[PDB]
Structure formats: structure tokens, C-alpha cells
Amino acid sequence: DDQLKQSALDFHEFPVPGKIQVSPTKPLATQRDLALAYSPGVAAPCLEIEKDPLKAYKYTARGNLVAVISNGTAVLGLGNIGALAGKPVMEGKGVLFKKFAGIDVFDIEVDELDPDKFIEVVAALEPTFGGINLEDIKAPECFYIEQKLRERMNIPVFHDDQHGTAIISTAAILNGLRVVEKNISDVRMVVSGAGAAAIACMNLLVALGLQKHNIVVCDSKGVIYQGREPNMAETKAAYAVVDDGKRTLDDVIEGADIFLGCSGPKVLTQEMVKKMARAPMILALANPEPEILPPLAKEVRPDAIICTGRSDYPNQVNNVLCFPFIFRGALDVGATAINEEMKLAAVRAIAELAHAEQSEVVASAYGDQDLSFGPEYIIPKPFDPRLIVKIAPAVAKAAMESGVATRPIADFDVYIDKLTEFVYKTNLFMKPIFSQARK
Amino acid sequence: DDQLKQSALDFHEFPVPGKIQVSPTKPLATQRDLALAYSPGVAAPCLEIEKDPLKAYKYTARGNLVAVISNGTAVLGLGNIGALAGKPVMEGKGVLFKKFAGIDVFDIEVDELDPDKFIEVVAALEPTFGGINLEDIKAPECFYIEQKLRERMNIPVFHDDQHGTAIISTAAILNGLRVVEKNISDVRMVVSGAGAAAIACMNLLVALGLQKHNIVVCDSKGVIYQGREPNMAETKAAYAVVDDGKRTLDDVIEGADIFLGCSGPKVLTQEMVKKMARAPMILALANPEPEILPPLAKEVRPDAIICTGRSDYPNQVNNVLCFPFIFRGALDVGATAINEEMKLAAVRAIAELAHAEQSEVVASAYGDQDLSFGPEYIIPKPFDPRLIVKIAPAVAKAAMESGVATRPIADFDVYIDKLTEFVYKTNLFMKPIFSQARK
Ligand SMILES: NC(=O)c1ccc[n+]([C@@H]2O[C@H](COP(=O)([O-])OP(=O)(O)OC[C@H]3O[C@@H](n4cnc5c(N)ncnc54)[C@H](OP(=O)(O)O)[C@@H]3O)[C@@H](O)[C@H]2O)c1
Ligand SMILES: NC(=O)c1ccc[n+]([C@@H]2O[C@H](COP(=O)([O-])OP(=O)(O)OC[C@H]3O[C@@H](n4cnc5c(N)ncnc54)[C@H](OP(=O)(O)O)[C@@H]3O)[C@@H](O)[C@H]2O)c1
Ligand SMILES: [Mg+2]
Ligand SMILES: [Mg+2]
């Protein structure tokens, strides 16, 4: 801990303070160059945007600018630490946005703790940005804030901690259902924990075909049943079950095909997994420590499919899998929203990439490929270079079909060539070398 | 126009859209590199800032980050064009901030037209930035907005269109009084126009020693006198004079030592210059076309000292002379404000650089130096490389003495050497070559 802490503190304070810098995209050394980057020259772009608001994507950086906005109320796993203390996290997220999709990011830390005040603050910034990524806002205010901002603004508003993990988890459940040969309309699902990542996953899975009468939820109190507390929260009363004497996790797990966990460590035990239905699908996403260790489940039930959020186990749910590429697809077509069809276009592409993989140009002997679709490889690996070329055109085409695109793509072959060109300029070959050298 | 228009539109539409890009400052290609910039690594800086908010300058880019914020209500000379149409101007101002002082800038365009709502939007963004530059906001809302933000926020708030021109124009008058040998407390000033740049100039000049009873202001209606309109706006009533019959500019120009002009073209005539006192000091800053052409003034009064806002004449009052360097000085010492003592320190440094000049290392014959103090050289030239080495330490020292500095500078020789190092690594040698080539 101390070594990791010291290496992180020095990781960037010493060369210059902090990551991120703003750089001009032009050489500038003369007059007549400053006379049209400013001065009477800069009045020509302004008078064009005034006549046509759609011309702002030609003359400014708006078509490539995303805001990462937070108020510091749920920062990683630290909790409520304040907007100022969460600045490094937002800078890091902007770094990830740039590294894997080439998207410029402004990270904004708002001091408002009141939801309506926060909404008023964010809705006023629309002319600056081409899209908004809400990050690290505690539940249940996140649902209300995102819903209000989405119905108030004419640029995409995407809360990543809700919807990115939902997209990845839905892609994993569809692929796992193929392995175990079940149907989405018959499966019994048990959800542990209600919160930012859980409500959104249930919503997406219902949108793809899961029956709401096949879902039971449990939180820190136990089973969410109807009339348990006098005033149950919204989004918690939409999944409450009729009272039947069931109050703990052990009552509802018998016969469950799917376990979805986003709540605490050591929640699911070996006996409960034993009582589960044949070929169980288990998603233990609790971050410091999963609800069950994958070795402890594969022993009692070796036919189980397990999917955690850690890097030392297969099938890792890492949010870097979708957000840069969905935002790239939305930005490149001038979409005014990221709707459900665009969101479902991302689920299908991610699942397809893992069960229709066509490798090519492996990392020599330097690594470990085993990209065979099955219980151990159900979703793509977090830094797979083909994720930009699969997701972004699918999201762009979905945007063009739901009528939310303002700058439609004429030829998708040219677009795919450009994206492949971008991805060739970025390879991470030291990662396979380090991984192989670990053994 | 059409040639200039087409060249300016193409200036940045074609390589990529718009100026500005966001770049990481640390190399990112491996794991353990995207595990300190994010992942469990990024939690260590966050817990440091939670304990001590001052550590946000060590682990984060806040100590070098400035916001240029506008609502597009007074954009250059175009007027009320909207926040979105003014985005190129803000990007250009950020580029100038980066070129001459090495300061990262986020340009923010806010759609709010209501002053109190605008204030609520801006004050909430304080954790993001180390300082605020207000830009292109029409009067009289600008005074109210700036006063409220300054009393509300704990980082420097600085409206450039008021205070930068006030500082530069006060430096010119201070030097011109040296040339013409007059005392600040005994001169009569006539101000043509009352607005963002005029009220601020008068306030600063009065702060330096001008008697308020030696000032007469004259807006588009003529002389501003007591009881002229039923509800005379504030900032226009503190400079109203008693009613004496004086209504036009012709009745107040006789015997005036200083004429300050920030209102329209062809306001001052030759016969009105003929009536001024000995050695008239004239500042005609109306940007499209000045109040009087300097040749027309010099024809009748060869001893007159004329300043303009146009570069084709000597003594050009250009805002690039002030804002980057005062912001650099305030940022380097952790100033929580830019008060009056810091504003006047910048006035003296600018005046000293021109009346106590020691040239050295001219651009050989490639240029036109003639940097001798006198009527034709009263303030430094717009891109003089010694401006940051003179202004930033003066402002930092003033912040240290007025008590608003949170990170005092221990050694000023080290600071000056660092600023000199920055100056060396950015030289504009093509400008004097082109200027001499034109002659
Ligand atoms: N892709 C990923 O790896 C990924 C993505 C998102 C989240 N996660 C992880 O998932 C966890 C929760 O994230 P979140 O956004 O959902 O935050 P959250 O809603 O604030 O926390 C989970 C919620 O579930 C309930 N809960 C907590 N402990 C529980 C327990 N032992 N048994 C049952 N319910 C419990 C609590 O709700 P009540 O207090 O109302 O009962 C709690 O607020 C964290 O560990 C997070 O890191 C992982
Ligand atoms: N460093 C520089 O070169 C520099 C810096 C700042 C400004 N400027 C220039 O100065 C001018 C004014 O700037 P500002 O910010 O003060 O704008 P402003 O506040 O919008 O306009 C100046 C005010 O002067 C009055 N006025 C207008 N025409 C007049 C006339 N013909 N005779 C007398 N008064 C008149 C009007 O006040 P009423 O409507 O209340 O009568 C007007 O609102 C512009 O040309 C601007 O570009 C130059
Ligand atoms: Mg997050
Ligand atoms: Mg301006």
C-alpha cells in the first residue's frame, strides 16, 4: 500500500504538476497569423456561426470536445470527498478519453450539492461542448439529474457509471446465454444491491428481453418486497416483489440462472451457488473484493460462468470497453442524443467481437492469445485495438436510423479506414511482454 | 474583406476543425502507467487533497489553469451574437494566453443572459480553476457581475475588457505626464463615452492621483450632468457634473490636458484639439476608426501626444500587453485575488519598461528599434519579450505584501531566471523581418 501510494503521488507531481495540458493546434510565429487567429480575422468564423449554428463543427473544436463533469459525491470507492478532491480522477478519465479515441476532454468539478442547482449549472454550459459525460455522482440523485439533463439538453448526456457497465454486463449475459443455451425470456435473475450500477443494468436487460416478473432484488435490508418500508424510493419500487415471506438472499437464489452482484464482498457463498440452476451465470462486480471469489465458485459448480471486475480473473468488466467508442460514434455523426437503439447497437457489437473473433497479427509468442469463445472468454479484453472499429460505426449507423444524427456519414468504408488509421498509430505491446514475463 | 474573410475561414477549418487540443503531459503506454493515472493509483492524490485542499496545486493542473468565460453579449465589435458564435474568440484568447505566458486555458461559453443566474453558474465552477478571466460581456451588466463574483469567489476574478485597457492606458498617461511635465493632481481630463473601457480607466486614474472634480464625461447624449435623466444609471452618476449649460464636447474641451476616447469615430476635430492645453495628451481607442487620425492631430498641435488602438500608428494600446503576465504573476504565488495593489504594480512595471529602457540584443538591422523614450515611444510594443520578466515578479511581490498570496516565493532571482528561460524558448523573429520588408 505504502509503495503504491508513494509511486502514485510522485507519478505526476514532480515533472510538472498533474496530467493534462492545452496545446494550440497550429504553429504561430508571425503577425498575420495572430491577425486571423484573433484580431479582425477571427470575426469571420463568428459571423458564420451566427448565421448558421451548425457551422460551429467546422470552425471550432466542438465536434470533438466532451465534458467530464462531477460534484465529487461518489468518487471511485472513496465516497463523498468533495469536488476539489476528485479532480485527479476526472483528469485521468479525460486522459483515457484521449488515448483510446482521440477525444478532447474538459474536466469540470462543480461545487453544487443540490440536484436542481446542479442541473441549472450544467444545462447552461451546452454551447461549449459536443457531449457531456456525467461521472461520480451518488445515488439516488444521479437518476434524477441525468433524466432532467437529458430532457433539457440537445447534446448527448451519458452517465458512465450507470450505462457503460450496463452495456458491458448485457453484452456478457447475451454471450453467456449462448454458451449455456438458454433463452432471455425464460431466465430467472437475482440482483444483489440496488444503486447506480444495478438499476441501469436491470433496465437494459429488460429492454433486451428479460421479464420483470423473473427479477428479484436484494439490498442491505434484504429482499426488496412491496410494503417493506413506508416510503420506498423510486427505481426501488419498480422491482419490488409481492410479499411472500422471502427476506434474505438464500431464499431467492434456489433455481436462479443469473446472479448479478454490485454490492459488497462475501455476499454469495458456496451453498447458495450449489442451489443455483444448471450452468449458472455469475457476475460479481464488487470492486475491492467480489461477492464470491471465482475459484470458490468453480469448485462446487465447475460448469459455472463467472465474470468479475478484477484484472486477475477472466471476463473482466472494465468500463474502458465502451465509453470512448460510443462517444466517438455519437460525435462523428453529430448526434443530439445517445438513445436506447444506439445503446443496444453497442451491446451487440461488443458481444459479436467475442464470439466472431478473427484474431490476425497476434503478439508473436509474446503473450497469451486463447481468444476462443467459451466460458473463459465471454467478452473482449479491456484494451483490444479493434473495439474502436466495431463499436463506433455501429453506434453511428444506429444514430442515423433513429433520426438523431445531424451530420450523417456518406460512406462507412472511408469512416472505417479512418478509424483503422487512428488505431494503427497506437499499440500497447509492452503489456503482453510484462504479462508473459510474470509467468 | 472577401480575400481576408476567405483566408481567415480557411485558417483553421481544413487541417482539423478549430484551434486548441487537450494533450496528456505524461507518456501512457503500458499497464502500471494506466494504473497510476487511474485505477487504484489515482486514489492517493485524491486522499491528499481531502486532508489539505492546498495540495491541489501539487498533484493537479489547477495552479496553471485559467477559465475564459463569456456569454457572447459583447463580442469584439460585433455585439450581441450569442455564446456559441463567440467560441472562436475565446479559443483565440486562450491561444494567446498559452503563447506568451504558458498558461492552460479552458474556454467556457454560457448561454445565460440574466446576471444573477450567470453569477450562480460561474461561482459553482471554482474547484476547476485557479483563476477566472471574464470576457466579452456587455455593460452595464459587466460591472455588477464582476463585483458579485469578486466578493463571492476565492480565486482571482478579472474582467479583461475593463482592467487590461485601464492598466495599459494608465501606464501611457503616467509616462506622458513625464514627457509634457505636468502633475497628475492638476490636469483636466475629458472622457468621450462611458462604458466597460472608460469607467475602469477613470477609476484607476482617480486611484493613482487624478482629482475626480477634474473630470467631465460625455456619452452619446453629450455631457453627463446631474439631473439629466429621471433614472441615471450607476457608474454614470458618480462622474456626472453640476448643470452649468455645458452640453456638447465643444463646451468642455477648452483647456483640457487629457482626452480619453472610447467611443466612435470622428468624435474629436482639429478645432477642438486647437483649444486644448499645451502639449495635448490624446488617447483615441475607438477600434474600428479612432476618434481622430493622429496625422490630423499632429498637423495643428505638433507637441501633442497621441495614442491609438491601431498598429499602423505609434503608441498602440493593445491588451496583449497586460493580461497574460498579471495572470502569470498571480498564479505563481497562489493569489486569492487580483486587488488594487497588484493592478498598480503592473502599471508601474509597464511604465518603467518604456521610460527606463535598456534595449540590448536588437534584431540586428532586421527591424525598426528606435526604443528611445519620447512622444513616439511612450509604452512598450505589443510583443516585447521583457514584459513577463518585469510584470510577473512585480505582481507576485505585490500579492505577497497585500496578504493575498498563499504560496510565497522565497527567492526572486530563481523566479526571474525561470521566466527568462521561458522567454528564450519562444522568439518571434519573423515579425520584424516582415515589417522591415514592407518598408
Ligand atoms: N465495472 C465494474 O467493475 C463496476 C462498475 C460499477 C460498480 N462496481 C462496484 O459495484 C459496487 C457498487 O457500486 P454502485 O455504483 O452500485 O454504488 P452504491 O449503489 O452506492 O453501492 C451499492 C449499494 O448496494 C447496497 N449494498 C451495499 N452493501 C451491500 C451488501 N453487503 N449486501 C447487499 N446490498 C448491499 C447498498 O444500497 P442500500 O444502502 O440502499 O441497501 C449500496 O448503496 C462497488 O463495489 C463498485 O466499485 C463495479
Ligand atoms: N485597447 C483598445 O484598443 C480598446 C480597448 C477597449 C475598447 N476599445 C474600443 O473602444 C470602443 C468602446 O468600447 P467599450 O467597451 O467602452 O464599448 P461600449 O461600452 O459598448 O460603448 C462605449 C459607450 O460610449 C458611448 N458612445 C457611443 N458612441 C458614442 C459617440 N459617438 N459619442 C459619444 N459617446 C458614444 C455609448 O454610451 P451610451 O450609449 O450610454 O451613450 C457606448 O455604450 C470600441 O471601439 C472598442 O473596441 C479599444
Ligand atoms: Mg466512475
Ligand atoms: Mg474583448
Short mmCIF file of C-alpha atoms in Angstrom, two decimals, chain B residues 164-177 180 184 187-193 197-198 200-202 204-205 210 218 249 253 256-269 273 276 279-287 289-294 297-298 303-310 313-319 321 347 350 375 378-379:
data_model
loop_
_atom_site.label_atom_id
_atom_site.label_comp_id
_atom_site.label_asym_id
_atom_site.label_seq_id
_atom_site.Cartn_x
_atom_site.Cartn_y
_atom_site.Cartn_z
CA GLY B 164 -6.42 45.40 -19.02
CA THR B 165 -7.18 48.51 -21.03
CA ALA B 166 -7.35 50.53 -17.80
CA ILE B 167 -3.86 49.35 -16.82
CA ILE B 168 -2.33 50.00 -20.24
CA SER B 169 -3.99 53.40 -20.63
CA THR B 170 -2.92 54.43 -17.11
CA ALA B 171 0.67 53.48 -17.93
CA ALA B 172 0.55 55.71 -21.03
CA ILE B 173 -0.82 58.75 -19.18
CA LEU B 174 1.77 58.31 -16.41
CA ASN B 175 4.59 58.32 -18.98
CA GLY B 176 3.08 61.17 -20.99
CA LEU B 177 2.95 63.38 -17.90
CA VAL B 180 4.96 67.01 -21.04
CA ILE B 184 -1.38 64.32 -12.04
CA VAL B 187 -4.64 68.20 -15.04
CA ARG B 188 -8.12 68.32 -16.54
CA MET B 189 -9.47 65.23 -18.30
CA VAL B 190 -12.36 64.95 -20.75
CA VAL B 191 -13.73 61.43 -21.31
CA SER B 192 -15.63 60.67 -24.52
CA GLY B 193 -18.02 57.79 -23.91
CA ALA B 197 -13.46 50.64 -21.08
CA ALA B 198 -13.79 54.22 -19.75
CA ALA B 200 -12.49 51.37 -15.40
CA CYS B 201 -9.87 53.76 -16.79
CA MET B 202 -11.33 56.68 -14.82
CA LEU B 204 -7.82 53.55 -11.96
CA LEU B 205 -6.64 57.06 -12.83
CA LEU B 210 -6.38 62.30 -10.54
CA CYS B 218 -19.66 62.84 -22.34
CA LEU B 249 -17.99 68.16 -26.34
CA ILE B 253 -12.60 70.61 -24.41
CA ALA B 256 -8.04 70.15 -21.26
CA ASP B 257 -4.78 68.33 -20.56
CA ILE B 258 -6.02 64.80 -21.34
CA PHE B 259 -8.59 63.50 -23.82
CA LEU B 260 -9.58 59.85 -23.34
CA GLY B 261 -11.60 58.32 -26.15
CA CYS B 262 -13.51 55.04 -26.14
CA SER B 263 -16.49 55.99 -28.30
CA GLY B 264 -16.92 56.01 -32.06
CA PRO B 265 -15.06 57.62 -34.96
CA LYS B 266 -14.52 61.26 -35.89
CA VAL B 267 -15.59 62.47 -32.45
CA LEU B 268 -12.62 64.83 -31.99
CA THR B 269 -11.94 67.51 -34.61
CA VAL B 273 -7.62 69.94 -30.48
CA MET B 276 -6.68 72.02 -25.64
CA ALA B 279 1.08 69.58 -25.27
CA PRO B 280 -2.26 67.72 -25.51
CA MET B 281 -2.33 64.11 -24.35
CA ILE B 282 -4.80 62.22 -26.54
CA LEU B 283 -5.92 58.58 -26.38
CA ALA B 284 -8.23 57.67 -29.28
CA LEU B 285 -9.02 53.99 -28.72
CA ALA B 286 -12.16 53.56 -30.86
CA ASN B 287 -11.12 50.32 -32.53
CA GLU B 289 -11.68 54.05 -36.60
CA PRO B 290 -10.18 56.24 -33.85
CA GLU B 291 -11.69 59.48 -32.61
CA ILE B 292 -9.10 61.48 -34.55
CA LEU B 293 -6.46 60.38 -37.03
CA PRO B 294 -3.06 61.08 -35.41
CA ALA B 297 -3.95 66.00 -34.55
CA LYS B 298 -0.22 66.42 -35.22
CA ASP B 303 3.60 68.87 -29.40
CA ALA B 304 0.58 66.58 -28.89
CA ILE B 305 0.98 63.00 -27.65
CA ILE B 306 -1.43 60.62 -29.38
CA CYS B 307 -2.24 57.00 -28.51
CA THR B 308 -4.46 54.64 -30.50
CA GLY B 309 -5.67 51.06 -30.64
CA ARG B 310 -4.38 50.54 -34.19
CA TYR B 313 0.44 54.26 -35.70
CA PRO B 314 2.94 54.64 -32.86
CA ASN B 315 1.85 54.08 -29.27
CA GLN B 316 -0.68 51.31 -29.85
CA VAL B 317 -2.73 50.35 -26.79
CA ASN B 318 -3.05 46.57 -27.12
CA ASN B 319 -4.50 44.30 -24.46
CA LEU B 321 0.47 43.83 -23.07
CA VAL B 347 1.06 49.88 -14.16
CA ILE B 350 4.85 48.75 -17.87
CA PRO B 375 6.44 61.30 -27.75
CA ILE B 378 5.56 56.04 -24.54
CA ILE B 379 4.64 52.38 -23.84
#
